[PDB]
């Protein structure tokens, strides 16, 4: 009756720099990469023949390897590349799910312009991608999603919470004016591969921060779906948007006790707990791709 | 065509102390809760009405509430009975995912005696529970999975790692001998929600320490896989158990260029990459429960 | 034999976020804020009697209060108004020591132009103060740190290591061409309180940076101390800067085991060891303030 | 006028995992080590000239072949071993400070027995050591600190806090029962090396836990001096001790609202801020010891 379920493995955070120096003017790309195969493996847990097992140290090799032999310009392409070599390489494997995070960085400006090989890190969210490639020949099927990470992000005001349903254990009062603050985390994922990567992840994000700033808010499920259909509007290759975002709390710390008014200006911002709220921006007719979503984000 | 989607709100990482003081022992229950309700809550999304939203502070508030009223034992019993209160009082909810984390306290040890009210964090895993209610009445359905992450634990020797598959990119050198050292991280479902809590998570907690420590692994997938079975073969009442287990590389150093020999004794204990290792074991002859794993590890 | 030494209290981590909205242009002062007091708080640690003693909560809304009161602009002036606040309050201290860092915003871009309420974490480091007040009326004595922290920089070239100290332990190869890339902490000491703070914080920023990137780095311990002689020569008004910067190292790959080449291409970002190179540069001809620096960066 | 001050440099945060293995019962030794050497290296700084300059790379490899060649018992042993084999090594060197972390295991429980090569962490605080040593032959000074960092301890009841300095803006009532939550850290100077370290260590730990737990407290001031003067007292090797010691604040939460009282029964466990009680307990009657403290806790 016991048996061996769902199972993948592979080198998780493989932290890779790669340097584009054909020229004086040097350019960065700055990646952790997460590997993971899955496939026949079943004897390697059950009986430990490790027989059809590629180690993760030389899925890591790999990550290196092509990072010079192929390079690495979009991520998603790099991540196609990886999960298509994984399928030459292990037989037993039946996909591959490959994800990777990009930490941009800008030249240090001197004296106008940017300089030629000294950098600073950007530090505005995170760029991700997750890739899953199933099968060969044929047979192959692949699936992308894109993402933004950590994207911090607040307005002072253009947010309202009132009229939700009260309860006798509700003391928030409504209000017309508060601050709306979060850490925005969000994946999307494309009709197909024939996208420009660079092209479309820099618009995405665009009309993400526009409509969180410029969309009135009457409660931070309505602006994510503001910014959710917003992007599948402007995107028709975009299948579906996920949107988690928590809400970081700034409350109007009270001054009466210190003969002080406060009109929306002293705010504590604590750490926890926190709103958070999730919502999913679909294209109904199109057919859905759990494949794509599996062990997203994470295994259990 | 563009639709809300799949979607769940509620309040995340209360932190929530609750003691026990009826008489001068006092006991202790530190808990971390995250609520989130499932439901209608498309016109909140997409025209803004709040109607059928019970606000996220009021999630928290019925925490601390209940945690006086309904007392805190067992975190399956109080995530159980904060889902349920949840459906009572937001009828628009069609679901509820509570996840609790609880930290363990030891009692302070003065003169070989546990002290009455002085405690000392036990700082050895955290015990986990996800909790999933759905409907009401005669239709209520609930599901819970239990765990516990972050159980970080070694192995000297009883670690081998050979035969597997070699790749052009292969460098790693074939073991008989090597550390094996991981973080737990797992998570399990039960058939039904008539169990002892508390002596179900000793012994599984047990079981799990053992295998690992007692099984000579020819791998991490084959460590995992005997440490689930046990835990399946000791409990028919577990259903299934999910486990996630980086392989925290500890690299033998080369001491020759110093005139020394390291026969298994100097290590490096390299933190970034690792392999992640990642298995379910399951009861074939039992029906699965997607519904119970929704949104675990998290919604995207 | 035994007595109480030295001693300070006050409220940690003060999440202080201030509103200027007197225009639909908003601005935003996002603050950390400890406060420490020294003084006469002997009997609350001997016998217990806390006269003496302001509590730490009270502390903490003082922050909040004076920043309605007094407003938040430089944080050195906020930082000088809450020590001499608290010495005011509290006959039985001699000393206040007010640290705050500050997490700077931008606006969301909207079609060109930055929005009057809806912002961005800039992400680009922290900007820290450490303002010591001491005494009362004609007695009273100042000191102003200010500082960069967290501030993540990288070159790709121009970056040197060659001509150390050998060593039977070494295995390190001289290089003339590496990456040298670091985390830059920093704090720098004002001869006086008559000081621009936003203008010399920016010029003091530019010269850092423009310094790390320009200057031919032929060590960690050669860069950094160009960069503080450089800020010692364009201001005279700072006495003093110490410089801490880990060298996070990125490992040239070998790739001759899968038949490329690595030409200064590809690199593992290491995690830990790092080196850490730490450096002051001084002014000869001031004397020093060792009371400006006490329990920075901590107490023990 | 401006020249190059105090300055330091080394590896930090160097992970060494030394194995005892003679016999089947294997033992284990986890630690973070960080090296730091001063002298003359201002030619390093000023010039460029690395003559002088051990690499910190090389300084890794010395933890890892004394790991080997010399053992890892006390950590204190480790570290004055370490610093006398830096000084022999750079003749440019005046001195070496060398601090080290280490992370206590347990052998898993199998059946009622801990096993052979099977580990848990035990995580209950880090010991700590920092030991400076300055000079060679008969001028060579040697001075240890030892300590305890990120002791989780909490008192449910037993502490109170009234009879405090009042001020215009205090809102915190008085009380006589309330918890007193913090997590400990501490360090303690040692009069020679003549010194069971093992010993001491594990007697200074007792008699911390125990006085937290068993003194009434009217303060944490008074709690850390109790605690502080009973280490004194007990060991007259000592020759002071600094306790550092957030209070973290668990609210009783008003329950009022929800038609419920709460006996000091139900509280927010709350991140920040969170007070910051630091104390020194020091020998009236031996010298003070400034060198063994520079660059503690860090250089800026």
């Not at 490639?133 to 994207?151: F, Y």
């Not at 994946?187 to 969309?215: E, G, M, N, P």
Request: glycine letters at 8%; a negative charge.
């Amino acid at each position: 009756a016991i048996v061996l379920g769902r199972n993948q493995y592979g080198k998780a955070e493989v932290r890779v720099f790669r340097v584009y120096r054909d020229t004086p003017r040097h350019e960065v790309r700055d990646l952790n990469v997460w590997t993971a195969l899955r496939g026949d493996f079943t004897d390697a847990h059950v009986t430990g023949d490790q027989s059809h097992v590629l180690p993760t140290d030389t899925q890591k090799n790999t990550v290196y390897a092509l990072a010079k032999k192929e390079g690495i310009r979009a991520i998603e392409d790099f991540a196609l590349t990886l999960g298509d070599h994984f399928l030459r390489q292990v037989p037993a494997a039946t996909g591959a799910r490959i994800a990777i995070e990009e930490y941009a960085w800008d030249r240090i400006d001197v004296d106008g312009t940017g300089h030629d090989h000294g950098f600073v890190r950007r530090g505005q969210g995170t760029r991700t991608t997750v890739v899953t490639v199933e099968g060969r020949g044929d047979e192959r099927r692949a699936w992308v999603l894109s993402g933004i990470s950590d994207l911090i992000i607040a307005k002072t005001t253009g947010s309202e919470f009132h009229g939700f349903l009260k309860d006798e254990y509700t003391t928030l009062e409504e209000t017309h004016d508060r601050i709306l603050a979060t850490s925005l985390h969000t994946r999307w994922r494309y009709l197909t591969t024939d996208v420009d990567w660079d092209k479309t992840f820099a618009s995405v994000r665009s009309i993400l921060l526009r409509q969180f700033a410029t969309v009135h808010s009457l409660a931070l499920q309505q602006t994510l779906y503001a910014m959710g259909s917003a992007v599948l509007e402007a995107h028709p290759e975009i299948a579906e948007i996920r949107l988690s975002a928590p809400n970081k709390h700034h409350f109007l710390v009270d001054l009466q006790p210190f003969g002080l008014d406060n009109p929306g200006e002293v705010f504590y911002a604590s750490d926890r707990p926190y709103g958070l709220i999730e919502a999913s921006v679909v294209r109904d007719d199109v057919p859905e791709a759990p494949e794509a979503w599996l062990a997203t984000p994470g295994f259990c």
